[PDB]
Amino acid sequence: DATRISRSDFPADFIMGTGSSAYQIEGGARDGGRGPSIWDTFTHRRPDMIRGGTNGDVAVDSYHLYKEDVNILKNLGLDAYRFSISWSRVLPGGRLSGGVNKEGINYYNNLIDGLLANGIKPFVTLFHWDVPQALEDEYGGFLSPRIVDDFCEYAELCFWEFGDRVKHWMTLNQPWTFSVHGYATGLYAPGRGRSTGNPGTEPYWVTHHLLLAHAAAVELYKNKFQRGQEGQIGISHATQWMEPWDENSASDVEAAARALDFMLGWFMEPITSGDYPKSMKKFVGSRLPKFSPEQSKMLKGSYDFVGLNYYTASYVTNASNFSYNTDIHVTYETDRNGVPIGPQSGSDWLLIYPEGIRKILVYTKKTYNVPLIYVTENGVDDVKNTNLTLSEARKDSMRLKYLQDHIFNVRQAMNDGVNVKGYFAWSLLDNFEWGEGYGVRFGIIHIDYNDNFARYPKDSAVWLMNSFHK
Amino acid sequence: DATRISRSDFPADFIMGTGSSAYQIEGGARDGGRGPSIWDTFTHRRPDMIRGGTNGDVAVDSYHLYKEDVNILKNLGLDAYRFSISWSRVLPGGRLSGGVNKEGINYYNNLIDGLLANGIKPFVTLFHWDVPQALEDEYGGFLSPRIVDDFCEYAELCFWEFGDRVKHWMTLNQPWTFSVHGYATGLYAPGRGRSTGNPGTEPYWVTHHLLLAHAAAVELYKNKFQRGQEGQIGISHATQWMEPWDENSASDVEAAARALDFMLGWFMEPITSGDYPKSMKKFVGSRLPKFSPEQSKMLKGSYDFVGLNYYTASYVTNASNFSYNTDIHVTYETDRNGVPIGPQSGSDWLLIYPEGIRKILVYTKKTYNVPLIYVTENGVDDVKNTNLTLSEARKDSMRLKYLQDHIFNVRQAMNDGVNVKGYFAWSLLDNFEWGEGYGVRFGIIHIDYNDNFARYPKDSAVWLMNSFHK
Amino acid sequence: DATRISRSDFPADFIMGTGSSAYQIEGGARDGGRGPSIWDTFTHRRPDMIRGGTNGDVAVDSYHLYKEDVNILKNLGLDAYRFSISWSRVLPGGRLSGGVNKEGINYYNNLIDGLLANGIKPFVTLFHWDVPQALEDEYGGFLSPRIVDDFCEYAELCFWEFGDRVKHWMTLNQPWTFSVHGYATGLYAPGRGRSTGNPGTEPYWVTHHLLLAHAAAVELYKNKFQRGQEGQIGISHATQWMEPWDENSASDVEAAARALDFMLGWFMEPITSGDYPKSMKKFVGSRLPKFSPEQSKMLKGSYDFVGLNYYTASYVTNASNFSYNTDIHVTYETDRNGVPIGPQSGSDWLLIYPEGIRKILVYTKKTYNVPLIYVTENGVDDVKNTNLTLSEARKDSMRLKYLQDHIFNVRQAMNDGVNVKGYFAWSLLDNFEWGEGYGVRFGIIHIDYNDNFARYPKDSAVWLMNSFHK
Ligand SMILES: [Cl-]
Ligand SMILES: [Cl-]
Ligand SMILES: [Cl-]
């Protein structure tokens, strides 16, 4: 029974925490010497692209309120906290010649020491879509392959400064989303894809550059730091369970496996065997870059653990110039015969399907043979309602049930022999939600935008504390 | 012609200025020992009643940022600034026994010395709807005639603490809107009359108590302070020009006179003659309270000057249990034949009718014989649009035309013989617009809610500085 | 013999301590954003009701001087300190929508870390009569059963913020005195029942709501916090030993049982059996509210331990519109023949009867079967005398004898089989004594009201340190 699930259902080394990302929570966008990211420029030059015409300038000010956030995490009582570093905060010109920003570095050391002073293990993510505008304007950010070198300098800087305290690193979080919405749909920064953009090619380049960035940085950590710092490095991928519309149509079973390949295979096959997946080569063909064999040699096996981000699920079936969206040759369906795959959440794109996480997990271990996994994101948003008062606003029953159901399923995947080491809820705080602006609330901690971002736990947080404290 | 209007069109002693009110700009709702006002409880207990479900806990933070507001005022170059004191900031329990708050007194004293250091004359308003919650809760606030004594204590504090430097006082601003929307429509705080409220009776009592509070405070100033401090005291009234829908229908002409009577005569006749206006006794009859004869002697001529707030105008015609709304027996028309009385501002209720201000002024002078008038409010709101970048956003041509046409008409009124002494635009800053929340902008100074309320002048501010500097 | 009593007469796990309550010591009534409690309004609106016409605006200033109180506690050497949180300090509008006050939370967190730095265990009391004025004014406070929900929000805040370090909680202290003197005699705040009050009904409702607030808060702790924080929760009851005026009159014996029933059974039977005591239903009958059966299921056994506050004792005999006072049908006798039950303290209502505490303890164990008890209050007041210099003033032999005799009797009770876990003297400091104002001194630490509340130990403090140090 899911409602009874608690810490003692898990092995003792199991890790529990929460998560944020720098641009969604920090604010202090032009403070302490930070330079502009592509999200800074996107939200300020294309306000029409954001619900409310808002931006992350202040966000929820974890830049100035990080001490409260740490006190929150100490009360919450979980093992670990996952956050990301703002590239253009530590290097405002993105590359070394641009300046090294001591104040930015001091911020993260203050963050990291606060966490450890309180027994909370930091899990740090080098990159979460916030590309320094300077690198974007000079050579097209991740379009160009120069990005690998700059990224590598940025990475080395973080390892040298923080690697004595941070022992768990991730190069990238959710690169899929950065590629697709950055360059295919043009909904996220830099906002490209109808030169003005091209959903047929750019996404594939960008992803190509992301993966070399990731593999270069892991070679760096592994050759220069790991022996002396003794940490571990890995990466974090967007996932979504893909169900065959018709369990029978062996052709649907195929539209589903293809939908995987194009989402998760696109990143996981490279770091597994040094190459993209067949289906992708087949359907993309010559628009899809190749790896030199030293590149493959570098990618193949570039990680100590993998993190999976899981929210939702879908039915897949087959489809009927060029674009990533169409290259997949599938159609997405939400119901079989009038029945949705699961109930809606506050967000119409998000259907609740706890069994999906069990599946995605088992699939991953089976298809790619990963020996160590973390779930690095999993959570749900609140129904929008500016009408509720706080005692109402905080009873977040759906989220609570969502957490218990997904955590129960993770536990099942383990029984199936998937070696999962921890689970992190998304997100710690309500925060900036990219194109959605401040309207969507994923926090286990509630935030009051009308009164300096006062923070208050929701019942999910009290429940996490009480059920998983240690 | 209007666009050429400048300070040299007016006499040398004429005064130009801008204005705000405490709850709309201050924030710092619970800082520096402020107690809660009825606007605090309303916005927090009934967020459904506010666009966005927002409140003025932070507002545009003038509580902390006033040094900046003062600098803006010094740059703007106008003679004067009109602001109001938050009753429950200085007396957080509303009455003396509730505690005198030194820190809130220190705040206004800093504001005031700050303005005086810069050559800016302070015009101060004791009351702008922000009734101390403690008084509302103890005896129903302006429902009870207890309010007259408490209001007097409050006023005497202010004169004692500030009267050495403030020389221009106003007891109430726009009492009309308070009565009507507080007690007839129930749209504003305390949100009554949509016991529980009675649109037929409460508005008339509230208004009755407002006027006695005003007259008691004026007797107090004049008997106990005027000789030593040598200030001047007055009051500010909502007004709207009322136009006969059909200039020919002597019946329409009268509906228009009656509509004035119930808006402006309701407050003006008592301080002129000691009594309510004839038409209101007729149509409201026995539901309309009466003044003892010593009350009338206190009310009559209880002011050194009067201010009028003008925004818009209207066509009036005759109408075909009880409520203030129906007691007027008029109907409101904008169109005289699908021909609107004037164009829309960014608000559909505000229609631009510059000659309105000229007429209201001339009417007030003739009907009530006021020897000295200020226009204490006048302004317009920008079209909403979260899509513009600041360079576009600050180009506020409508407002700029609006100001010149209205200021031009004020000049006319002075030619017509009205003694107008000054004119304040509304408002200085974009701010909390009551039930409209933050979505409506009246400022000559733009505000960026996304970036700690950064202030930036709009072309109207620039124009006012350039044409009226001194 | 009593005078030789020392820590080595007790088991090793036995706990000694001292205590205060928030409104009696803190002061800082309007500092750090505290909101007003009913004791604030009562003392300020009805000063005639307080000896001297004084209030606890400053009290003995522990709000500012707590570092000093902490040092005193470290010097005193006892295991524990019992204090209470001021509801309206943490939530100045009493309910969440009223604002969460960080600064009041920071205050208790400093107090608490301060005590823990010094090896002193904090025992914390959520409620000690200081009802937020905002709640009293909105819906009559503990008159309404709304209070149960608000009280629960409050309690959950406290457990979330402090429960990582506070491991010993109490929901209410001395609810009896609150009901009776708040609502029957009208002597204490809110001062009712001497509408307007009704000694016949309100006390019974107040008490009814107190017990539901207590039981809701305990269910909350036990279901949402206990597992993660591992604390313990309980409650503290007023008690007085009731002695049969004539040991022979079986009728007197019963008046005594009935007098207990109406003081202690009134609170104790509900948390023991789910219901009021038999005798109270009989004599109060239909005026006594009833528990739905889920209420009784929540109440029954709703505590981890119970504390008893004992001061004095009394002889009871039978008595010959309605009020709590008369419903008891008993009369109180001190003299058994011009032979007083014991000598006077500095207060004529307090008569020294050490075996009282032994009997009350044994009775509680037998009648209600509590497995775990603390004596949470016990102390005596000095003879008034503004004539003594400090060297004389601090020689408090009566108190010192009083403590030894009572502590001796506690030891007896443990021989008699009662499981007493600790004992706290009352109070640490001389302080605000409610209707008695400052004229009455219960402190083991003297206070000099003439010289910023300088603290100085009295011989009893010295003795307690010397005999009970650890
Ligand atoms: Cl370089
Ligand atoms: Cl008073
Ligand atoms: Cl609430």
Secondary structure, 3-state, chain C? CHHHCCHHHCCCCCEEEEECCHHHHCCCCCCCCCCCEHHHHHHHHCHHHCHHHCCCCCCCCHHHHHHHHHHHHHHHCCCEEEEECCHHHHCCCCCHHHCCCHHHHHHHHHHHHHHHHCCCEEEEEEECCCCEHHHHHHHCHHHCCCHHHHHHHHHHHHHHHHCCCCCEEEEEECHHHHHHHHHHCCCCCCCCCCCCCCCCCHHHHHHHHHHHHHHHHHHHHHHHCHHHHCCEEEEEEEEEEEEECCCCCHHHHHHHHHHHHHHHHHHHHHHHCCCCCHHHHHHHHHHCCCCCHHHHHHHCCCCCEEEEEEEEEEEEEECCCCCHHHHCCEEEECECCCCECCCECCCCCCECCCHHHHHHHHHHHHHHCCCCEEEEECCCCCCCCCCCCHHHHCCCHHHHHHHHHHHHHHHHHHHCCCCEEEEECCCCECCCCHHHCCCCCCCCEEEECCCCCEEEECHHHHHHHHHHCC
- Using CA atoms in the order C241, C246, C248, C249, what is the torsion angle rounded to 10 degrees? -100
Which domains are delineated in chain A? 1-470 (3.20.20.80)
Alpha-carbon gap, residue B132 to B126, rounded angstroms: 13
Min Cα–Cα distance to chain C from B169, Å: 29
CA B131 to ligand 3 center in whole angstroms? 21
Specify the 3-state DSSP secondary structure of B90.
helix
Q: Is the dihedral of CA B138, B142, B148, B152 positive or negative?
A: positive
What token pair was written down for A45? 């030059």
User: Mutation test of the interface with chain A: which of B441, B448, B450, choosing the one with the most A Cβ atoms within 10 A?
Assistant: B450
Give the CA distances from residue C9 to residues B99, C12, C307, in Å, rounded to whole numbers and listed in that order: 51, 9, 21
Count residue pairs from A and B with Cβ separation < 8 A.
42
Of A299, A297, A119, the C-alpha closest to A207 is A299
Q: For A252, phi and psi rounded to 5 degrees? A: -90, -40
- Give the containing element (helix H, strand E) for A254: helix A252-260
Contact A388/B54, CB-based, under 8 Å? Answer: no
What token pair was written down for A461? 């947080």
What residue has token string 């080394």? A13
CB contact A466 to C (< 8 Å): yes
Identify the closest residue of chain C to A388 by CA–CA distance: C97
Query: Method of determination?
Result: X-ray
Of C56, C52, C157, the C-alpha closest to C100 is C157
Alpha-carbon gap, residue B267 to B295, rounded angstroms: 14
Alpha-carbon gap, residue C60 to C438, rounded angstroms: 10
CB proximity under 8 Å: B 32-71 to A: 44-45, 47-48, 52-55, 57-58
Of B132, B432, B87, the C-alpha closest to C35 is B132
Contact A454/C100, CB-based, under 8 Å? Answer: yes
What token pair was written down for C139? 């819906």
Give the CA distances from residue B175 to residues B9, B128, B310, B325, in Å, rounded to whole numbers and listed in that order: 32, 8, 14, 16
CB proximity under 8 Å: A 374-413 to C: 389-391, 394
CA A233 to ligand 1 center in whole angstroms? 25
Cα A145 vs. chain centroid, distance in angstroms? 23
Alpha-carbon gap, residue C123 to B415, rounded angstroms: 78
Q: Closest-lying ligand to the alpha carbon of A100?
A: 1
Q: Which of the other chains make 3 or more beta carbon contacts under 8 angstroms with chain A?
A: B, C
Contact A44/B452, CB-based, under 8 Å? Answer: no
Of chain C, the end-to-end C-alpha distance in Å amounts to 22
Of C362, C396, C359, the C-alpha closest to C379 is C396
Specify the 3-state DSSP secondary structure of B204.
helix
B340: number of Cβ within 10 Å? 15
CA B95 to ligand 2 center in whole angstroms? 5
Specify the 3-state DSSP secondary structure of B58.
coil
Alpha-carbon gap, residue B440 to C330, rounded angstroms: 69
Contact present, A307 and A237 (Cβ < 8 Å): yes
Give the CA distances from residue A63 to residues A69, A449, C17, C87, in Å, rounded to whole numbers and listed in that order: 10, 16, 42, 31
Of chain A, the end-to-end C-alpha distance in Å amounts to 22
Specify the 3-state DSSP secondary structure of B266.
helix
CA B321 to ligand 1 center in whole angstroms? 80
- Using CA atoms in the order B22, B25, B31, B37, what is the torsion angle rounded to 10 degrees? 40
What token pair was written down for B56? 């003025």
What residue has token string 């899981």? A310
Resolution (angstroms) stands at 2.2
Specify the 3-state DSSP secondary structure of B259.
helix
Strand partners, C215: none
- Give the containing element (helix H, strand E) for A393: helix A390-393
Alpha-carbon gap, residue A64 to C245, rounded angstroms: 68
Contact B387/A45, CB-based, under 8 Å? Answer: no
Chain B residue numbers touching C29 (CB-CB < 8 A): 99
User: Mutation test of the interface with chain C: which of B58, B89, B101, B133, choosing the one with the most C Cβ atoms within 10 A?
Assistant: B133
What residue has token string 């004869």? B293
Q: For B394, phi and psi rounded to 5 degrees? A: -85, -5
Task: Tell me the one-letter amino acid at C407.
Answer: I
Contact A75/C160, CB-based, under 8 Å? Answer: yes
Surface-to-core class of residue A289, CB atoms within 10 Å of its CB (0-12 exposed, 13-18 middle, 19+ buried)? middle
What token pair was written down for A367? 């298809």
Specify the 3-state DSSP secondary structure of A319.
coil
Q: Write the residues followed by a gap in chain A (C–N more than 2.5 A).
A: 194, 320
Q: For A290, phi and psi rounded to 5 degrees? A: -110, 160
Strand partners, C317: C331
User: Mutation test of the interface with chain B: which of C45, C95, C97, C100, choosing the one with the most B Cβ atoms within 10 A?
Assistant: C97
Of B138, B297, B142, the C-alpha closest to B208 is B142
Contact B387/A48, CB-based, under 8 Å? Answer: yes
Contact present, B23 and B130 (Cβ < 8 Å): yes
Count the alpha carbons within 13 Å of A120 in the hemisphere toward its beta carbon: 28
Task: Tell me the one-letter amino acid at A306.
Answer: V
Q: Apex CA C327: angle with CA C324 and CA C328, to 5°?
A: 100
Task: Tell me the one-letter amino acid at A354.
Answer: P
Chain C residue numbers touching B57 (CB-CB < 8 A): 99
Q: For A251, phi and psi rounded to 5 degrees? A: -75, -15
Q: Apex CA C107: angle with CA C103 and CA C110, to 5°?
A: 130
Alpha-carbon gap, residue B331 to B406, rounded angstroms: 26
Chain B residue numbers touching C93 (CB-CB < 8 A): 36, 41, 44
Contact C96/A457, CB-based, under 8 Å? Answer: no
Give the CA distances from residue B467 to residues A94, A424, B19, B376, in Å, rounded to whole numbers and listed in that order: 47, 61, 18, 19
Contact present, A446 and A393 (Cβ < 8 Å): yes
Contact A58/B451, CB-based, under 8 Å? Answer: yes
Q: Write the residues followed by a gap in chain B (C–N more than 2.5 A).
A: 194, 320
- Using CA atoms in the order C295, C299, C302, C306, what is the torsion angle rounded to 10 degrees? 150
Contact A52/B386, CB-based, under 8 Å? Answer: yes
Count the alpha carbons within 13 Å of C416 in the hemisphere toward its beta carbon: 19
Contact present, A154 and A87 (Cβ < 8 Å): yes
Q: Apex CA C143: angle with CA C138 and CA C144, to 5°?
A: 65
What token pair was written down for A458? 């929701």
Q: Closest-lying ligand to the alpha carbon of A391?
A: 3
Contact C228/A469, CB-based, under 8 Å? Answer: yes
